[PDB]
Amino acid sequence: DMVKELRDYCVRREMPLPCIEVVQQSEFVACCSVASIVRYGKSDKKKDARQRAAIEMLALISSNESMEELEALRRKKFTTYWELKEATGMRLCDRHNYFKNFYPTLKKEAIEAINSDEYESSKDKAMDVMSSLKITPKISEVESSSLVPLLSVELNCAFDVVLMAKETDIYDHIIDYFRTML
Amino acid sequence: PRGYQLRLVDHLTKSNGIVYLPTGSGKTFVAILVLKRFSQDFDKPIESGGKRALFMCNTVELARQQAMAVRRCTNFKVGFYVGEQGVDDWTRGMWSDEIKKNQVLVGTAQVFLDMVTQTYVALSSLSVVIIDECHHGTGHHPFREFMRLFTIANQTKLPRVVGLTGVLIKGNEITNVATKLKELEITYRGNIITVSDTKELENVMLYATKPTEVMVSFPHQEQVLTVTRLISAEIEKFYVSLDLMNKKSFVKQLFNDFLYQMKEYGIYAASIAIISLIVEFDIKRRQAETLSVKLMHRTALTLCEKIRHLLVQKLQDMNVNTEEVIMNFSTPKVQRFLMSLKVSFADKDPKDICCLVFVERRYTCKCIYGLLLNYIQSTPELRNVLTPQFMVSVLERKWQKSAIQQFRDGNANLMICSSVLEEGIDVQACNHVFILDPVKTFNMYVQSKGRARTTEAKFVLFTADKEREKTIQQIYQYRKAHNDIAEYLKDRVLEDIDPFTNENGAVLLPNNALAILHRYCQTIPTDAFGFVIPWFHVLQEDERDRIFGVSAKGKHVISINMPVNCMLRDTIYSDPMDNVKTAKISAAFKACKVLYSLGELNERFVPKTLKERVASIADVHFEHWNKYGDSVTAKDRTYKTECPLEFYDALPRVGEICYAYEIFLEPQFESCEYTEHMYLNLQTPRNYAILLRNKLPRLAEMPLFSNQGKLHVRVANAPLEVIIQNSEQLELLHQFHGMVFRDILKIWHPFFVLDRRSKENSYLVVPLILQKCFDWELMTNFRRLPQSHGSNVQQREQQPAPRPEDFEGKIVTQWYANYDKPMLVTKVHRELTPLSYMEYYEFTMSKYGNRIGDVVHKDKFMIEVRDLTEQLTFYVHKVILIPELCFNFNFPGDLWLKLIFLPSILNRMYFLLHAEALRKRFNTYLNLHLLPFNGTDYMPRPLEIDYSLKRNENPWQKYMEPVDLSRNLLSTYPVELDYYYHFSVGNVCYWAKNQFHMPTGNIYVKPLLILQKTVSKEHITPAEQGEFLAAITASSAADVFDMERLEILGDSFLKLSATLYLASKYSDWNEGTLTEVKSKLVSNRNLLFCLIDADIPKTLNTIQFTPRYTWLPPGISLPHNVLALWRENPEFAKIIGPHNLRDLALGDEESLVKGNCSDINYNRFVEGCRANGQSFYAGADFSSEVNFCVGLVTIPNKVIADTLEALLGVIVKNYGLQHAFKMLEYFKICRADIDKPLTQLLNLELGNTTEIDGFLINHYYLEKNLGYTFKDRRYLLQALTHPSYPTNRITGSYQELEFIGDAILDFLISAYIFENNTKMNPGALTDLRSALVNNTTLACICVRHRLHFFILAENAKLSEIISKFVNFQESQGHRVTNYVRILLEEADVNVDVPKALGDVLEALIAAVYLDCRDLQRTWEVIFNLFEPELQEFTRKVPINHIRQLVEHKHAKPVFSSVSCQFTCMEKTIKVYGFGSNKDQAKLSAAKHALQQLSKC
């Protein structure tokens, strides 16, 4: 069931909806243009050709669910064409709203924590902000001129957010990025 | 008028030069032509008169561009000495060796400053120094230091300096233009030379009308916004962190550019710049290997996204593509521009308005395109009137090419263009030229103001209030500069005789003499690229003195050099005259006078048309056309038929000798159950014989066929000689003949009567029994086969008991429920009896309820019968029963079987006897009638069957191209950004080697036998009888052979011989006159008339063999009275038809003893003929049906010409070319001169060393690649000289040799294909031949063998069209791909395949032959050149394009009778097909459609 699988990788990977159209009479050529990328699969039957083209489109789009479970918790993504049926993807311009496009509840905790100044606000203010947003920090050192060693913090999201700063202020920049984006 | 390029090249050849060409990118063609006009000494060594050239450039990268360009466009060896190659520290030894190998030394000015300054290469050694970007050479510069080297060296031995520049003065130095330009002239030792401002080249510096002008103001932002500072600070924090690293500079540059775009073009436009930066950084992050480098590109992206989030949030305060969001958040500059665009472009005529906006950088263009599209779309006032586009990695180039064309075509109205530092904007004249970013260079000002070309057009320039005064000052300085450069350049720009009356009294005037010369130049054969015109040249003082005395000392003389295609080749020197005008007028008069005298102009002084030239030679060569009533100077036919000479008057008499040639049928199959009845019976010694008064030659052994198997027929060479001793024995013979065709095999029609007059086909067939003798008892008893009467039961009682011997081999028919079906008694089943049950008395009785009575005999033998076939045509590949009931003709089984095969042996023999007659005649004429294998000792070989006969540029396509991420920034889905990466990396889809190097790899001699038979008479083989029979057998006859394969060799040879004959006889003609007279000397009509005059069309095998409805049997004819009437009255003949003839119903005496029809029957017949016309089916052409009766055939005008060609083919194959040439004067195609024999056409004359060698610079490499070394290199020179070559006055064009060459190639290729491809049908051989001698298959080989580097031409078009083709082919692999075949050619009226490339290959083939004069050595070259393409095309033959269109599975050809309709991805698309002739037009339309189908 290639049509179903392609429709899925499209809806799941946050790619746009695939549109399959066969036009030649004779024995059938399917032109599918998921996202201005058009590949042609031609076979004997109307229904049969579509399947071949869908593999062709799938192969190119795939080439480019353990992680997804977490992200599903943080967003209202449908996660299946049918789930979309259950009831126009992200463009390169609108990816800037990742953290910002999140569940009112987790952020509302983070917004309160980052604004609130009631504790040992060192890495306990930053950790709180991210912990509410279900975020794990992959902290790592710089590779040269390590005076007040810089840390490269990578968060576990599709956006691939990596923040670099001085040891003392790495903990302040995390707080700042989060503030601006939410 | 000659193009600026050619005139510039002439001026540069005459004197030093600085070519200032602002636009058109034609600097390269001029650089290449000058380099070629000074290349007569690039071969000689420096030790004795050698000379080399230099191409000094400012930059190494520019030098690479110019070295590659020289190698591609020239046959000159090119060295590339650039300082980075450790070219420094070179000993005199090395600079000596490198000037020995290379000729055009291309490099950087520093390398050659050192070379010339040190005594390494003297300026005397140089013929031409070309300096690129000559503006740079001012004050202290390697260019200026080089020219001072010139000012110290010995004079009278200094090179020709040709500087090239597009920007006359360096940027912003505008103070004293005049002084700077004078200094530049003094430096390069020669005046600047530029073209005027006309249609062909738009000059920027010399345009007069100036556009209306506007300067617009905008104030400083009242408050800097907060997000501008914050975004600025965050990029500072990033700069500190990334500074601590390990590439880094590029990441920094992009962020600094963004900052520029943000401050100068506004907050909103930054929202479109950050999307651009994200794309770039992502592409790069993927293009990495070290994880740490990738880390820099990842952290940058995270900042970019924070930026888009921030910059967007500010706008969000008010999709944010609304007019009121672009307006409120934009630097006052952009607010002014957006309003100014809106108010001005309120004419609202999309087609009328055209606006060019110039911006500072590349990224700016990207961002402003974005801002403009989103403002326009959201603004009701501008939307639908304004469409934007931006003009500024291999894929990147193609996208811009589409954008520039979109603006030029007129789809897009606005073009945002980046800075043009040293180049001219290449767009049409705009209307409102806006400059958003301030002008920084004079070149920017002149190039920009240049685009506004009408007074109506406006030039608007945006400057801030504070800088307004300073800009008003610089614009006045840039306007004064323009007006000064303009005057200096204005000076330096590229700008009564009595009549003669002919004998007739027409008057040539010296005014029209140029017009008449131009018409004569339009007549001579020219390429699609354009006509060639005469070349005028004023003579300098030294020449005037040498040619003429004090007569032209103070006077001017101009010479006119006619094109080589014109007959006149000698230069005509004009009258010594007072003015330049009386020089040109006189030169023209003198040329027209000489052309008239050479018979190239009518008595009315107007060049002769092709028709008039043909009319003069029409009587000389086409005289025979007159009798038939059709003349050369502006279907089918009915011919009689003649039996062979041996069959005419062959009726045996009753007092003379009679020859019986017994016919021996020999089965060639295996005995089985199926064929046992066939083998034994056919081999029985009871054969029939052909009895005739005349003797017969030795006839070949023909293959007949049958259901069982093939069998061989052999008429015996020796005749048993017998004399008839009676007149009743003759009647026995005649009656037995009548009864075979009347009864044994029914071929009888009511009209048929025995033909007792000898007349035609009068031979007899007689039974023969064991030596041998005529069977006289069989003849008596079977005068008429008895009727199957059958009988009654009581009658059946008295019948004697059947005896075994009685029915051993005889023939029987079943009386129960059947009519006249004869069957052969294979064996008597004596052992079994009627009572026995079958694996039976009842079986038969039940089967015929009343038809059979009770059997009289309970016990008897039962006969086994195998029925006999009903078909009388044989050329193309256990019913045990009761005896009492079957009727027993006593006829032998032995003969009945053989006589079924008789009608098809008799027909084949008629035609084989015609074949022997032709053999003898031709052999006698060629005087080979005495050779021992052609004499009385000739023993012919069997007919053999032809088993072959059926009877027996980028790799990616359109849809795979990624979207431009740049032109669609705000709506590119993240998926594409990944596709772009892989596709670009290709995951989804030199100075030591000479240009003329043939790559050693596989793309994709054994002597011709005809050329061995031509040289040695030992190899000659006998012209066989089967070959002449195949050569007269048309394909419609449905036989085992045909004239089609021999016709290919015959047509090839007839075209070669006509070419050689016309080229030798008339050697002062053009290809145009020679190719027309040839195409009319080998035309179907000429050949048809020739064959009709030779009487060959009557003796032809063209009509199928339906032995019953379309055949009169030998010795059996129509009633003599009726046959006389048909011939006597042409009027009745028309009405005499099938229905009338069948009603005659002759019987007994009328159809046997008495020949003539009875008077009553005659009356019945004539009344019948009148009735049809007066009643119904009147005026019907019953000619097909009743032609067979009177002996007439209808043959098309095609088969007759094909037969002539096939006879020529037989002669060529068996006797070589010289004996075949004699045949062409036999048919009176080629009239033969007394002075020059026809046979010696091959060796007939088909037609200073140092001068010839000058044109052929690296001919060693041409000869090495061609495989033939030229002794007389005058043939090489003429093979290479395009008609557009002014310097080659020694020889003529390539056009004379191509004529001779296309014939030598066609003939040799065809002989090879015939001899080696004998398993391919004649249709496939015609296709393989037409696809091996195409003009696109020859152009591919010419490029493959690198022979196009030596073509001598100076045409702009031809050179571009040759380069596009060679670059196409270099990628294709140098193979004849489908795409090359679909490319448009010159013949199909935009040309992709230049014709010149292919004619030059044919001419080189001709030149090879004229030097060697050996068709064997001409073949060794042709084979080596065509060996790769012969192998591939034989494996898969290239189909006619018609076939590709018709056989397009998805597409449906719809030709109009030639517009063609087709289906591409099922979209209705029709492309018009054009062509002068419908047959050629059909192909042409297909090709166009096929390209269109690929276009999809």
Query: For B656-677, what is the HEC assignment?
Result: CEEEEEEEEEEECCCCCCCCHH
Q: Assess whether A11 and A81 both reside in one domain.
A: yes
- Cα torsion B498, B503, B508, B510: sign: negative
Q: What is the DSSP letter of B740?
A: I
E strand spans, B1402-1478 = 1454-1455, 1460-1464, 1467-1471
CA-CA-CA-CA torsion sign (B57, B60, B64, B65): negative
Please state at what angle helix B1322-1332 crosses helix B1415-1435, rounded to 10 degrees: 110
In a 3-state reduction of DSSP, which class is residue B1394?
coil
The C-alpha of B977 sits at a distance from chain A's nearest C-alpha, in angstroms, of 9
C-alpha B356/C-alpha B349 separation (Å) is: 16
Q: Are residues A35 and A80 in the same domain?
A: yes
With CA atoms as reference, the chain B residue closest to A30 would be B1465
Burial degree of B151 (CB within 10 A; 0-12, 13-18, 19+): exposed
HSE value, Cβ hemisphere, 13 Å, CA-based, for B1152: 15
- For residue B131, give Cα distances in angstroms to B156, B294, B492, B500, B622: 20, 45, 20, 51, 62
Contact call for B246 and A144, based on CB within 8 A: yes
Residues A122 and A77 in one domain: no
Range of the domain at A47: 2-89
Cβ neighbours of A163 in B, within 8 Å: 299, 302
Do B964 and A83 touch, CB atoms closer than 8 A? no
Give me the helices (H) in B939-1070, please.
974-985, 1009-1015, 1025-1032, 1044-1065
Q: Which of B1231, B1306, B1243 is nearest to B1050 (CA)?
A: B1306
H or E stretch at B1422: helix B1415-1435
Strand pairing class (B160-165; B17-20): parallel
Q: What is the identity of the amino acid at B1193?
A: V
Residue B563 neighbours by CB under 8 Å, 6+ apart: B521, B524, B532, B533, B534, B1283, B1284
Other beta carbons within 10 Å of B945:
18
What's the structural domain count of chain A? 2
Burial of B546 (0-12, 13-18, 19+ CB in 10 A): exposed
Q: Is B532 helix (H, G, I), strand (E, B) or coil?
A: coil
Which of A10, A26, A37 to probe the B interface (max B CBs under 10 A)?
A37
Look at residues A89, A116, A137 and tell me which one is the last residue of a structural domain.
A89
Asked if residue A84 is part of any domain, the answer here is yes
Q: Which residues contact B931 (CB under 8 A, 6 or more apart)?
A: B1020, B1022
Which of B292, B308, B1449 shows the shortest C-beta gap to A26?
Answer: B1449
* Distance set, CA B1024 to CA B277, B1030, B1252 (Å): 84, 10, 51
For residue B1051, give the nearest of B1269, B864, B1202 by alpha carbon.
Answer: B1202
> Closest residue of B to A95, CA-based?
B305
CB atoms within 10 A of CB B656: 9
d(CA B1455, CA B1142): 46
The nearest CA of chain A is from the CA of B293 a distance in Å of: 11
Residue in this structure with the two tokens 């071969």, named with its chain if needed? B43
State how far the Cα of B554 lies from the Cα of B547, in Å rounded to an integer. 14
Supply angle C-alpha B223, B229, B235, rounded to 5: 160
Whether residue A163 lies within 8 A of chain B, CB to CB, comes out as yes
CA–CA dist B233, B227 (Å, integer): 10
Contact A92 B1449 (CB under 8 A): no
Backbone angles phi, psi at B1314, to 5 degrees: -50, -60
Q: Report CA torsion sign: B690, B696, B701, B704.
A: negative
Q: Which of B396, B433, B434, B426 is nearest to B967 (CA)?
A: B396
Query: For residues B821 and B844, is the Cβ–Cβ distance under 8 A?
Result: no
- Together in a domain, A17 and A68: yes
CB B238 within 8 A of CB B277: no
CA B1117, B1123, B1126: angle at the middle one, nearest 5? 145
Q: CA dihedral in degrees (B662, B667, B668, B669; nearest 10)?
A: 180
**Residues A62, A38 share a domain:** yes
Contact call for A15 and B973, based on CB within 8 A: yes
Residue with tokens 């309709």: B1461
Nearest by Cα to B449 from B218, B217, B265, B214: B214
> Which two structure tokens, joined as six digits, stand for B633?
């100077």
| Nearest in space to B198 (alpha carbons), one of B185, B208, B212, B190 | B208
State the alpha helices, DSSP H only, in B598-662: 610-622, 625-628
Residues B1461 and B1479: their CA atoms lie apart, in Å, by 18
Last residue of a domain, one of A49, A64, A89: A89
Nearest 5°: phi and psi at B983? -60, -45
CA angle B183-B189-B192, nearest 5°?
Answer: 70
Q: How far is CA B253 from the centre of its chain?
A: 55
In a domain, A69, yes or no: yes
Task: Determine whether the interchain pair A14/B974 forms a contact, defined as Cβ–Cβ distance below 8 Å.
Answer: yes
Report yes or no on A94 lying in a domain. Answer: no
Task: Decide: B1465 and A31 in contact? Cβ < 8 Å.
Answer: yes
Tokens 């059926």 — which residue? B950
- Phi first, then psi: what are they for B1203, rounded to 5°? -65, -45
- Chain B residues with CB under 8 Å of A44 CB are none
Q: What is the dihedral of CA B605, B609, B615, B620, to 10 degrees?
A: 90
Q: Are B853 and B796 in contact (CB under 8 A)?
A: yes
Q: How far apart are CA B744 and CA B892, in angstroms?
A: 12
Integer Cα distance of A121 and B170 in angstroms: 63
How far is it, in rounded angstroms, from Cα B303 to Cα B306?
5
Distance, CA of B396 to CA of B403 (rounded, Å): 11
A76 and A112 in a common domain: no
From A89, A116, A143, give the residue that closes a domain.
Answer: A89
CB contact under 8 A, A93 and B275: yes
Same domain, A70 and A128: no
Residue A38 touches partner B, C-beta closer than 8 Å: yes
Q: In angstroms, rounded to a whole number, what is the distance separating the alpha carbons of residues B2 and B533? A: 9
What tokens appear for B1229 in the block? Answer: 């195609």
List the CATH number of the domain containing A160. 3.30.160
| Min Cα–Cα distance to chain B from A69, Å | 22
Name which of B1193, B919, B1135, B1147 is nearest B1031 in CA terms: B919
Q: What Rg value do the Cα atoms of chain B yield, rounded?
A: 46
- Taking alpha carbons only, the member of B1145, B1098, B1105, B1102 closest to residue B1122 is B1145
DSSP structural state of residue B1149: G
Count of H-run helices and E-run strands, chain B? 52, 37
- Give which of B875, B914, B854, B908 is closest to B1038, Cα–Cα: B875
Do the beta carbons of residue B434 and residue B459 sit within 8 Å?
A: no
Q: Which residues contact B1439 (CB under 8 A, 6 or more apart)?
A: B1327, B1447
Contact B1026, B917 (CB under 8 A): no
- DSSP H or E run through B19: strand B17-20
- Both tokens assigned to A175: 């707080």
How was this structure determined? It was done by cryo-EM
Domain assignment present for residue A22? The answer is yes
User: Hunting for tokens 């159950």 — which residue is that?
Assistant: B673
How far apart, in whole angstroms, are the C-alpha atoms of residue B592 and residue B931?
Answer: 58
The set of residues, in sequence order, having a beta carbon less than 8 Å from that of B1230 and lying 6+ positions away, is B1057, B1058, B1061, B1081, B1221, B1224, B1238
Which residue has 């932002």 as its token pair?
Answer: B221
Residue A10 lies in a domain: yes
Rounded CA separation B586/B559 (Å): 10
A70 and A18 share one domain: yes
Strands B212-216 and B458-462, bridge-based pairing: parallel
Asked if B1035 and B1042 touch (Cβ cutoff 8 Å), the reply is yes
Q: How far is CA B712 from CA B675, B688, B834, in A?
A: 15, 15, 40
Nearest to B302 among A36, A40, A161 (CB): A161
Q: B235, B241, B271: which to substitute to probe chain A, counting the most A Cβ within 10 Å? A: B241
Say which of A16, A142, A163 has its CB closest to residue B973. Answer: A16
Looking at the DSSP bridge assignments, the partners of residue B1436 are none
Q: Please, which residues 102-131 of chain A have a Cβ atom closer than 8 Å to chain B?
A: none
Could you tell me if A112 and A141 lie in one domain? yes
**Structural domain includes residue A96:** no
By 3-state DSSP, what share of chain B in percent is helix, strand and coil, each rounded to 5? 45, 10, 40
**A142 contacts chain B (CB < 8 A):** yes
Bridge partners, residue B1193, by sequence = B639
Same domain for A113 and A169, yes or no, is yes
Query: Can you tell me which residue has the tokens 């353990």?
Result: A66
Cα distance between residue A147 and residue A133, in whole Å: 31
A24 close to B (CB below 8 A): yes
Q: With contacts defined as CB-CB under 8 Å, which chain B residues touch A100? A: 309
Ordered DSSP codes for chain A: -HHHHHHHHHHHTT-----EEE-----EEEEEETTS-EEEEEESSHHHHHHHHHHHHHHHHHH--HHHHHHHHHS----SHHHHHH-----SGGGG-STTSS-HHHHHHHHHHHH---S-TTTHHHHHHHHHTT---B--B-SS--SS--EEEE-SSTT--EEEE-HHHHHHHHHHHHHHH-
Q: Find the domain containing B584 and state its range.
A: 500-613
Burial class of B363 by CB neighbour count within 10 A (0 to 12, 13 to 18, 19+): buried
Could you tell me if B893 and B864 are in contact, meaning their C-beta atoms sit under 8 angstroms apart? no
Say how many C-beta atoms besides its own lie within 10 A of residue B302's C-beta.
20
Which residues have a C–N gap over 2.5 Å right after them in chain A? 26, 64, 87
Place of tokens 């008789």: B902
Per the CB < 8 A criterion, the answer to whether B713 and B704 are in contact is yes
**C-alpha distance across the termini of chain A, in Å:** 40
φ, ψ for residue A160 (rounded to 5)?
A: 60, 60
CB pairs under 8 A between A and B: 118
Binding residues of B for ATP: 21-28
CA distance B933 to B936: 8
Please choose, from the candidates B1349, B1301, B1331, the residue with its C-alpha nearest in 3D space to the C-alpha of residue B1434.
Answer: B1331
Write out chain B residues lying below 8 Å of A88, CB-based: none
